[PDB]
Amino acid sequence: GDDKKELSAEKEAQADAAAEIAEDAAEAEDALQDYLNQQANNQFN
Amino acid sequence: QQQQIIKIRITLTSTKVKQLENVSSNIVKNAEQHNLVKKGPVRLPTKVLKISTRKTPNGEGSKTWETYEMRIHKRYIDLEAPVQIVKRITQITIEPGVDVEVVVASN
Amino acid sequence: ALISKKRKLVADGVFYAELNEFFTRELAEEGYSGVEVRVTPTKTEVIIRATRTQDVLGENGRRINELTLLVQKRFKYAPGTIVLYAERVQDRGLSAVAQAESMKFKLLNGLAIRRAAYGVVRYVMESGAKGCEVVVSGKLRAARAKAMKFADGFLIHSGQPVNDFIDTATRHVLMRQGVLGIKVKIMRDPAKSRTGPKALPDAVTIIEPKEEEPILAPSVKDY
Amino acid sequence: GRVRTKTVKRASKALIERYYPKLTLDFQTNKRLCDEIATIQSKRLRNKIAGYTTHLMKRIQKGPVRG
Amino acid sequence: MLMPKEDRNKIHQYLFQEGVVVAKKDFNQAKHEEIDTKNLYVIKALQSLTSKGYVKTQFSWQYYYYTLTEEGVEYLREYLNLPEHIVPATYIQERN
RNA sequence: ACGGAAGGGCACCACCAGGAGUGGAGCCUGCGGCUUAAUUUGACUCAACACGGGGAAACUCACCAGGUCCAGACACAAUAAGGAUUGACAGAUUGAGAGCUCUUUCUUGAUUUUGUGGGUGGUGGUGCAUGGCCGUUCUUAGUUGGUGGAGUGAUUUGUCUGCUUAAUUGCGAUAACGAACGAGACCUUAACCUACUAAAUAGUGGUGCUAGCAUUUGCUGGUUAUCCACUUCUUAGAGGGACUAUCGGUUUCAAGCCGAUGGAAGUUUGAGGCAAUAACAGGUCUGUGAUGCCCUUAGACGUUCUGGGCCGCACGCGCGCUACACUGACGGAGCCAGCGAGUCUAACCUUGGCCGAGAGGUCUUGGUAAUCUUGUGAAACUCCGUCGUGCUGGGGAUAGAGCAUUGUAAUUAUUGCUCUUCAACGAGGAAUUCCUAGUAAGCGCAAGUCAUCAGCUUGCGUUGAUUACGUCCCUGCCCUUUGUACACACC
Ligand SMILES: [Mg+2]
Ligand SMILES: [Mg+2]
Ligand SMILES: [Mg+2]
Ligand SMILES: [Mg+2]
Ligand SMILES: [Mg+2]
Ligand SMILES: [Mg+2]
Ligand SMILES: [Mg+2]
Ligand SMILES: [Mg+2]
Ligand SMILES: [Mg+2]
Ligand SMILES: [Mg+2]
Ligand SMILES: [Mg+2]
Ligand SMILES: [Mg+2]
Ligand SMILES: [Mg+2]
Ligand SMILES: [Mg+2]
Ligand SMILES: [Mg+2]
Ligand SMILES: [Mg+2]
Ligand SMILES: [Mg+2]
Ligand SMILES: [Mg+2]
Ligand SMILES: [Mg+2]
Ligand SMILES: [Mg+2]
Ligand SMILES: [Mg+2]
Ligand SMILES: [Mg+2]
Ligand SMILES: [Mg+2]
Ligand SMILES: [Mg+2]
Ligand SMILES: [Mg+2]
Ligand SMILES: [Mg+2]
Ligand SMILES: [Mg+2]
């Protein structure tokens, strides 16, 4: 990374931590095949 | 209608004294707290597992040695109580870290 | 059974250690963050502290089943004597291991090195940390190896409070040109310790005196 | 050597500053005083302190002290 | 590998039951725990099954952790001929 | 950042004052070298050379002489049920009861085999591609920010003449004030608790039951519960204790330092653990299923099996052990530690009894252990003898012959015992190492390794000094000042 574009790092970094707070706020609420294995040879026995 | 004094020996063993002594003094009170008959916690000599090793993965350097150690703390409390309290006292009072052992027997 | 107590406690540690490993490998993409093994009569209980516990689970119980079976068949348990339970962690933002594995992941979707770490700092900080610090060592794109410190806020580095207050973790992220190492170091505010010392051994609070209005010639009050 | 670090000497200052009535030429009670009157995290650091805040005390009696 | 169909079956069979296999990295055992063939037969059997996408392999502390995957759950469904809506330890046990 | 300038410091990996030595010898053991089929390899100033936990008989193992096997995923293609392929008894063959290969002619049934692609293992290379860990600088004391001051600025001052400290530890001086990392604090261990909570897995007093000698009551023993009581000694929980206290010297009467009294303790209480910023082409791909790239992949650098090798010996270097005797050797006798460790799906730690000169054997036994081994009755050391300064009975190298143990295996002699054989070495040139109090030195023990093997290491206790309590002379480092055309920074 270039020292000549540090600000642009810290900023997208900031936003990264921001969207990380998004995913962790929407987690403060957010939104069979039977017969069995050993038994299908006990039935087909 | 049941019960009967069975003469019991609880042995507590761990590496974390606060929890160990948690379960220890908790037990002793909660036994005379309803009038049993015991011999209070006997702390056996705490015993120290050392491992002494070179820090280096290889060979280079002044030979720095380094000793790891693990302390084992073992208690035992002897109880004279009916069949009931025993199990009541075994199942609960449990704790992540303390090993409880209950033996019975005259010998 | 029939084991020397010495043998037994050492024995138990190894067990935790093999266990912890296994999960760290199997459950990385779910932010595995550590375990604990509660021994009881009738059951050995294993709680998985991972951040994304919906995946640790699977469709109506698919994955934890597999895991148990796995854990079971290895150490030779008797189907029922072993029990697995996943469980989200209170704030990943103060879990070394959590954030190491985050970088690993960050850096594998190929975020700029600094962008990766600098956000990792700035989230840990946000998660209420009293200091954090990240090292990235190894080789990127150039041939010669480098290293960087990324740190913010307050850390301490010596003596017992270390054991008390700083969490650390090294993870090895394996890339194409070579393999570089992450080192995360979060330090938690001692003021909230819940169960230990509530401050640095350094803290010396002086209580603020009350201003008093003295004088007044004697007198005495009856009751 | 037995040179008291700043944290000890700093703290002694602060205490004499605002508890000269109370406090004594006696360490033993200056000790107990420190418990009520200030939080410290270790018995060692407290006596280390109270011993020195007694020192400073013991020689204010014989003239001022800068600080 | 070189191994009779009989041992291939036992393997695939056992895999379809448990939906999971473990095995110590040590060839030359000649008897697996649980399964009934050579250790070598297992490890390399699933190795194939894995590298044709049907199962995950995990290593750690010398010990091979095999997980049956959905796409595989089809394949050995064929190899064992058993009908759709069969099994693999993908029930919730009793009231467990 | 660096200097071959200048001024200050700091230190038994520096000297002073001394101790005990290494350097000389015999052997043990690493490194070189040489030799060899191979004598696998890393590392070479402190910071390579009893280091890689590296004590290799197989294994380990990487090296050498040979012999098997694929454990060559998966994809396409080919051969192909008239059989793709697999195995084998005997013989031959072979080191071999390897169907290795061949003779012969059964067997097996789509699991292989051939090809290309793609993988895969590899103690193969590369540590000058890397992670991680470690060592070194460092027995060091340094690093940074807020508000203020200076500067256009990079920066600076704060972070300093002096004094002080183990310490950028403090006092003080002061365009600075007041803080944080590192030092301190903290934690661990060894010291003090007749105060607190207890104990047949620790121990004391009394009492029974009882032995011995005295007898006048006494003295000395026996008895895993015949009973009562206690917690001094032992154990480990919770507290308490010390803060260089009181006093007195000395000091910019400042931080401090010194002496005396008291105290378990007054050298950071003694010893450790932790340990900022930064640096090195330090070491490690031979710890890793950590790893990039390179090499190799069936007549293999994969792996395994048989045998040899790491031990080879004109010689150079390093760590060590044992000694050159009388403060001793030998023989009888006294007889005292502490840190440890021990067997489940097993053969670990071993008491007691026998047998044996011994090493050892055999029969039983206690212990998953403060319960048993074990009071680990250890060694120096203490006592009474013998020998008498003579290479002597100091010394025990080398060597012969016999017994026994571990092991599938002991030859190139694993180790142990016995008789014999009886070397060098008469205190060590130039040089050089370590160290300040329960320390040095002497002395043995347990643990790691470990089937068997410690002349090594990590710890431990036993006996217990002489001499400093200083300095900058040597050596090493740190600091200012100062020069620079260096900044990939004097490689
Ligand atoms: Mg600090
Ligand atoms: Mg410290
Ligand atoms: Mg001298
Ligand atoms: Mg000399
Ligand atoms: Mg071999
Ligand atoms: Mg091919
Ligand atoms: Mg090819
Ligand atoms: Mg490899
Ligand atoms: Mg290097
Ligand atoms: Mg490295
Ligand atoms: Mg090299
Ligand atoms: Mg010193
Ligand atoms: Mg300005
Ligand atoms: Mg300066
Ligand atoms: Mg006591
Ligand atoms: Mg005295
Ligand atoms: Mg180099
Ligand atoms: Mg490595
Ligand atoms: Mg060798
Ligand atoms: Mg050495
Ligand atoms: Mg005989
Ligand atoms: Mg028995
Ligand atoms: Mg002679
Ligand atoms: Mg002799
Ligand atoms: Mg040994
Ligand atoms: Mg060694
Ligand atoms: Mg200049």
Swiss-Prot record, chain A:
Subcellular location(s) of the protein: Cytoplasm; Nucleus; Cytoplasm, Perinuclear region
The organism's place on the tree of life at top rank: Eukaryota
Processing after translation: Phosphorylation by TORC1 upon nutrient replenishment inhibits STM1 and causes its release from dormant ribosomes.
Phosphoserine found at: 8
Biased composition (Basic and acidic residues): 1-14
UniProt cross-link Glycyl lysine isopeptide (Lys-Gly) (interchain with G-Cter in ubiquitin), position: 11
Signal peptide interval: none
Self-association and partners: Associates with mature 80S ribosomes. Binds to the head domain of the 40S ribosomal subunit and prevents mRNA binding by inserting its alpha-helix domain towards the mRNA entry tunnel at the decoding site, where it blocks the binding of tRNA and mRNA at the A- and P-sites. Interacts with EFT1; interaction sequesters EFT1 at the A-site of the ribosome, thereby blocking the interaction sites of the mRNA-tRNA complex, promoting ribosome stabilization and hibernation. Interacts with CDC13. Associates with the telomere-proximal Y' element.
Other comment: Present with 46842 molecules/cell in log phase SD medium.
Family (UniProt): Belongs to the SERBP1-HABP4 family.
Name by which UniProt lists this protein: Suppressor protein STM1
Gene for this chain: STM1
Entire protein: shown range: 111 to 164 of 273
From Swiss-Prot, chain B:
Protein name listed in UniProt: Small ribosomal subunit protein uS10
Family of this protein: Belongs to the universal ribosomal protein uS10 family.
Assigned keywords, A-Z: Acetylation, Cytoplasm, Isopeptide bond, Ribonucleoprotein, Ribosomal protein, Ubl conjugation
GO biological process: cytoplasmic translation; maturation of SSU-rRNA from tricistronic rRNA transcript (SSU-rRNA, 5.8S rRNA, LSU-rRNA)
Function of the molecule: Component of the ribosome, a large ribonucleoprotein complex responsible for the synthesis of proteins in the cell. The small ribosomal subunit (SSU) binds messenger RNAs (mRNAs) and translates the encoded message by selecting cognate aminoacyl-transfer RNA (tRNA) molecules. The large subunit (LSU) contains the ribosomal catalytic site termed the peptidyl transferase center (PTC), which catalyzes the formation of peptide bonds, thereby polymerizing the amino acids delivered by tRNAs into a polypeptide chain.
Statement: the UniProt record of this protein carries the keyword Acetylation: yes
Cross-link Glycyl lysine isopeptide (Lys-Gly) (interchain with G-Cter in ubiquitin), sequence positions: 7, 18, 87
PROSITE patterns the record matches: RIBOSOMAL_S10
GO cellular component labels: cytoplasm; cytosol; cytosolic small ribosomal subunit
UniProtKB/Swiss-Prot annotation, chain C:
Segment forming the signal sequence: none
CDD domains in alphabetical order: KH-II_40S_S3
Subcellular localization, as worded in the UniProt entry: Cytoplasm
Residue numbers bearing the Phosphoserine modification: 95, 127, 219
Matches recorded under Pfam families: KH_2, Ribosomal_S3_C
UniProt function note: Component of the ribosome, a large ribonucleoprotein complex responsible for the synthesis of proteins in the cell. The small ribosomal subunit (SSU) binds messenger RNAs (mRNAs) and translates the encoded message by selecting cognate aminoacyl-transfer RNA (tRNA) molecules. The large subunit (LSU) contains the ribosomal catalytic site termed the peptidyl transferase center (PTC), which catalyzes the formation of peptide bonds, thereby polymerizing the amino acids delivered by tRNAs into a polypeptide chain.
Protein name: Small ribosomal subunit protein uS3
Name of the gene: RPS3
From Swiss-Prot, chain E:
PTM statement from Swiss-Prot or TrEMBL: The N-terminus is not modified.
Keywords: Cytoplasm, Ribonucleoprotein, Ribosomal protein
Localization of this protein: Cytoplasm
Gene Ontology biological-process entries: cellular response to amino acid starvation; cytoplasmic translation; positive regulation of protein kinase activity; positive regulation of protein phosphorylation; ribosomal subunit export from nucleus
One Gene Ontology term, aspect cellular component: cytosolic small ribosomal subunit
Keyword Ribonucleoprotein found: yes
GO molecular-function terms, A-Z: RNA binding; structural constituent of ribosome
Domain of life: Eukaryota
Protein family (similarity comment): Belongs to the eukaryotic ribosomal protein eS10 family.
Note, other: Present with 7650 molecules/cell in log phase SD medium. There are 2 genes for eS10 in yeast.
SUBUNIT field: Component of the small ribosomal subunit (SSU). Mature yeast ribosomes consist of a small (40S) and a large (60S) subunit. The 40S small subunit contains 1 molecule of ribosomal RNA (18S rRNA) and 33 different proteins (encoded by 57 genes). The large 60S subunit contains 3 rRNA molecules (25S, 5.8S and 5S rRNA) and 46 different proteins (encoded by 81 genes). eS10 interacts with GCN1 (via middle region); this interaction is direct and promotes GCN2 kinase activity.
Full protein name: Small ribosomal subunit protein eS10B
Organism of derivation: Saccharomyces cerevisiae (strain ATCC 204508 / S288c)
The encoding gene: RPS10B
